[PDB]
Amino acid sequence: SIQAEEWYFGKITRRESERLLLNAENPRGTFLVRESEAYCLSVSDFDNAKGLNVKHYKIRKLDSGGFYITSRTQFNSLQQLVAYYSKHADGLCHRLTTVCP
């Protein structure tokens, strides 16, 4: 199920996700998917005026079933959405490089 995915962290808070993502070993683009406290994608990123920071994206769910962050691309599962943005940032701050430990 989704709970067998190592990138899925359940219903954690934004503060907890930033605490998990932002340590000094996690590379730029480390990420996790969490349930909204429908899902949220949280990604670490670096910029000079901010340093290493987390961006949070809402993953919207269609009534017909698919998921999307931009209307430009939609997916039938969270697994396909994570696969796509691991290959292409395509508007996200950074490509998904590393599953958060």
């Binding site: 961006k55 949070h56 994206y57 809402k58 962050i69 931009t70 508007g91 996200l92 701050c93």
Partner: peptide, 4 residues
């Protein structure tokens, strides 16, 4: 939440 960031809008892409």
């Amino acid at each position: 939440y960031e809008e892409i």
